[PDB]
């Protein structure tokens, strides 16, 4: 089966930058036809993929002129010229020279901005929550960026790490900023014995921790 | 122009047998090229399964354990996927294609052994400038489900986050930033929405 890889897995470009993406084939795509099926999409969040070059260097309706590829052989690249936002996701390249049909790995594609520090927010259990039982304490890191953020939870002081959940957004095309969640949950037990609820967040826009807290 | 469509039964028991639904409109199925059936993966990786040309004759990925066939019917202008006996490991997201140029939206298969649940939601409000609330919905089974908030009037600084697997059960928190001059002399509701259990919510965000 032909293997398709793909270079870099991660890419940051700043706005109005060109950038490039490297697609690496385990076998000639050269079809007896003389051509070379080999095609790219995006993937923007939430959405499907979509072709934007296809057969090597054509180029479907409605995509920009933004967009070309090229290669060699067993090298290909797709060069996005002008670097817009709305570019952000993950890029694929695939092969239909041979069956089975191959996809590569995918490419993120980041958009590079300014560093930009998690406006934090901490929230105490329900009401609802608590009369069922259930303690969850949530934390809301938004609109900070890069992605790179760590997070502590602790009760009276100290720290814990068993009943934590954490899910981070996709990059916002909007600002190019990320946004994460967190959730400790404990049982309605377990919260009613202890006092202090902190939320810690560390991240590249300080050299120290931001602290959002609450008393129970 | 051409349009895909995907429909599917949603959760289903492993070594159920299931099938699932292409419409197409705007192009004849039977007019000309091949018709294919893709998957992605939790971790984002595609696999191409297999299509169905115009002749009504079938092409698959021989590289694969799923046990599988595409059919058709062409006066409804319809293709489909049939999964024989599903296991764990076909969970993921089936999208149909002309070629590779016209995608659907998609359609999520999750097999699991797990029950359906409808979810809690409960009601995130404070304890600046700006002002932030949230939603917790907790403890469903499958999704997808359906946060809004202000019956989607209001969209701008929401920040809904993709759901996280805990013990067979899916939580889901959304965040929103609104001016402090909004809430709570202005209601801010939460609208949650499981067609799954067929359950739909509506939280007000109260404050205290
Ligand atoms: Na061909």
């Known amino acids: 089966d032909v293997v398709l890889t793909q270079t870099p897995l991660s890419l940051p470009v700043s706005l109005g930058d060109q950038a490039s993406i490297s697609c690496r084939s385990s076998?000639?795509?050269?079809?007896?036809?003389?051509?070379?099926?080999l095609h790219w999409f995006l993937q923007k969040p939430g959405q499907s993929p979509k072709l934007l070059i296809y057969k090597l260097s054509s180029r479907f309706s409605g995509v920009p002129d933004r967009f070309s590829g090229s290669g060699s052989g067993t090298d290909f690249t797709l060069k996005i010229s002008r670097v817009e936002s709305e570019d952000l996701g993950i890029y694929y390249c695939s092969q239909t020279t041979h069956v089975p049909y191959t996809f590569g790995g995918g490419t993120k594609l980041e958009i590079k901005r300014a560093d930009a520090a998690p406006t934090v927010s901490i929230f105490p259990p329900s009401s609802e929550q608590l009369t069922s039982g259930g303690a969850s304490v949530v934390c809301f890191l938004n609109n900070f960026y890069p992605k790179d953020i760590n997070v502590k939870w602790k009760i009276d002081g100290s720290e814990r790490q068993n009943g934590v959940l954490n899910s981070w957004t996709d990059q916002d095309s909007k600002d190019s900023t990320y946004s994460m969640s967190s959730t400790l949950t404990l049982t309605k037990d377990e919260y009613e014995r202890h006092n202090s609820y902190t939320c810690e967040a560390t991240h590249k826009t300080s050299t120290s921790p931001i602290v959002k807290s609450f008393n129970r | 122009d051409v349009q895909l469509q995907e429909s599917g039964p949603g959760l289903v028991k492993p070594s159920q047998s299931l099938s699932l639904t292409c419409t197409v409109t705007g192009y004849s199925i039977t007019s000309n090229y091949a018709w294919n059936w893709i998957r992605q993966f939790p971790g984002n990786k595609l696999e191409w399964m297999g299509f169905?040309?115009?002749?009504?004759?079938?092409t698959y990925n021989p590289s694969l354990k799923s046990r599988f066939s595409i059919t058709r019917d062409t006066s409804k202008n319809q293709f489909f996927l049939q999964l024989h006996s599903v296991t764990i490991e076909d969970t993921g997201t089936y999208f149909c294609?002309?070629?590779?140029?016209?995608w659907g939206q998609g359609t999520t298969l999750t097999v699991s052994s797990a029950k359906t649940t409808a979810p809690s939601v409960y009601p995130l409000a404070p304890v600046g400038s700006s002002v932030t609330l949230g939603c917790l919905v907790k403890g469903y089974f499958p999704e997808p489900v359906t946060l809004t908030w202000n019956s989607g009037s209001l969209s701008s600084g929401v920040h809904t986050f993709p759901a996280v697997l805990q013990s067979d059960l899916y939580t889901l928190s959304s965040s929103v930033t609104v001016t402090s001059s909004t809430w709570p002399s202005q209601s801010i509701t939460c609208n949650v929405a499981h067609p799954a259990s067929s359950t739909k919510v509506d939280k007000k965000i109260e404050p205290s």
């Open positions: 076998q000639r795509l050269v079809h007896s036809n003389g051509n070379i099926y």
């Open positions: 294609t002309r070629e590779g140029d016209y």
């Open positions: 169905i040309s115009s002749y009504g004759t079938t």
